[PDB]
């Protein structure tokens, strides 16, 4: 798992490598209100439901 904080992994003798994620999703912001909720649901899929 690679959260937005990122992570590092050590493989054999190689140097550790760090990988970071981006705030990417599947909805459409600046669309119909049934698409803005979709956008803010890929991000934080636990507080959007409560707020709605």
């Amino acid at each position: 798992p690679v959260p937005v904080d990122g992570m590092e992994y050590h493989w054999g003798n190689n140097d550790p490598v760090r990988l970071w994620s981006q705030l990417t999703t599947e909805g459409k912001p600046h669309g119909w209100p049934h698409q803005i909720v979709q956008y803010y649901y890929g991000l934080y899929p636990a507080a959007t439901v409560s707020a709605v």
Partner: protein, 438 residues
């Protein structure tokens, strides 16, 4: 000109400060934390290493008796056996058939290579932070090594800098620490003088050169077999060798906040947490008189493209009318967006471009070029790439502006409902006043 600020303790984050003196044109500094180092304070408890058992040759007394003598040696064991009849290759000596005696002796001592291969048991407390900050502004560009506590002032090009104490007091080392070569272990070791056989700390020494030694390995002697000379014994195997095979994990692969643990000295590096207050004291030669810098009027900020990604994925444009061409110091007064540059060349053409990185769907920030001001607002689309190998260049703020599409919809719906409720209130008030007037 005294100034104060607070800058994040994140390696590589391009912090820029805006200093706006009342009599001079504004200035923009750039500070960056190239490297950080967290140093604990250590008190050595003892040293452990593999033991080595010393077995002197037996003393077989022919036709007689021998007596054991006590000695002051670590884990000394001595016993006397009767009725022995040894043998050798050519014949059996001790002519007396059964009135013989063998004295078995053994004791333990620190190994030969304990000075090269040993583990130290420390107590770690009261960490001290130390950094290496790169400070650049105007025509100044230098890197300095600073102690991050409010008592080390370093002068960079005539300016005094005091980096205040770290905001938080979090350190990754427990009270007790066991160090081996280049690995640090969060472990609880037995007290000196009470180590148990077979586990870590079966033999303990206060220091690698210290003459005293506490050893407890359960060394026990046994009666030799008939017709042989061998001094048998049994002993619980080494504790340092059990420990090496069963220490488990480390701290190099377990520390929070992604900070590397290094040894000699013990130190945790690049460990992102907290904020670093900064105090300054600038001379009067850094600024420029407001008369000399250009005058900027009618500033409009328009956003070309936006994409809330990690790198600088937004392009900004400024239109203005200026009298003379020179230099300004751009800055963004909200942490929603972070510009890339701290200086722009203004020209009579009246058009400059800037790059910014943001992490919210609809940002709103106020940007200033020399003394002017402007409010920028834009709509940004998410990026497609799932994973990238560089850290975020924004402050990671997500709440959109009240003028964004989502919040515009919320405002409109709430306004409609509020108008309905106000109309109902008015109807009720009119009805009740008419009823009471009767």
């Amino acid at each position: 000109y005294e100034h104060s600020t607070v800058m994040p303790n994140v390696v590589g984050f391009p912090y820029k400060a805006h200093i706006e003196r009342p009599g001079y044109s504004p200035l923009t500094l750039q500070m960056q934390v190239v490297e950080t180092s967290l140093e604990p304070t250590l008190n050595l408890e003892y040293i452990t290493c593999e033991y080595k058992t010393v077995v002197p040759s037996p003393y077989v007394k022919c036709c007689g008796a021998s007596e054991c003598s006590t000695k002051e040696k670590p884990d000394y064991q001595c016993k006397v056996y009767t009725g022995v009849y040894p043998f050798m290759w050519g014949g059996a000596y001790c002519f007396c058939d059964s009135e013989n005696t063998q004295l078995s002796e053994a004791y333990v001592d620190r190994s030969d290579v304990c000075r090269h291969d040993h583990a130290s048991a420390y107590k770690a407390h009261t960490a001290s932070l130390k950094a290496k900050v790169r400070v650049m502004y105007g025509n100044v560009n230098q890197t300095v090594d600073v102690y991050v506590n409010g008592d080390h002032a370093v002068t960079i090009g005539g300016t005094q800098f005091i980096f205040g104490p770290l905001s938080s007091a979090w350190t990754p080392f427990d009270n007790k620490i066991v160090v081996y070569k280049d690995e640090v272990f969060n472990q609880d070791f037995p007290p000196y003088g009470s180590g148990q056989p077979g586990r870590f700390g079966d033999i303990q020494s206060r220091t690698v050169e210290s003459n005293d030694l506490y050893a407890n390995t359960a060394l026990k002697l046994a009666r030799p077999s008939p017709g042989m000379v061998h001094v048998p014994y049994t002993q619980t195997p080494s504790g340092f060798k059990y420990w090496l095979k069963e220490k488990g994990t480390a701290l190099n692969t377990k520390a929070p906040f992604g900070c590397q643990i290094k040894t000699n000295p013990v130190r945790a590096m690049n460990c992102a947490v907290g904020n670093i207050p900064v105090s300054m004291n600038l001379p009067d030669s850094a600024f420029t008189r407001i008369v000399e810098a250009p005058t900027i009027i009618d500033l409009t900020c328009t956003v070309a493209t936006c994409t809330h990604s990690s790198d600088f994925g937004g392009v900004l444009t400024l239109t203005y009318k200026t009298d003379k061409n020179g230099d300004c110091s751009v800055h963004s007064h909200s942490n929603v967006a972070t510009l890339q540059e701290a200086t722009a060349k203004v020209k009579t053409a009246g058009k400059v471009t800037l790059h910014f990185s943001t992490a919210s769907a609809s940002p709103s920030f106020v940007v200033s070029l020399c003394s002017a001001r402007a409010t920028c607002s834009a709509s940004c689309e998410p990026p497609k790439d799932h994973i990238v190998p560089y850290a975020a260049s924004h402050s990671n703020v997500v709440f959109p502006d009240m003028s964004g599409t989502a919040l515009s919809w919320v405002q409109k719906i709430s306004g409609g409902l509020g108008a309905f409720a106000i109309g109902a209130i008015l109807v009720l008030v009119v009805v009740t006043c008419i009823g009471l007037r009767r």
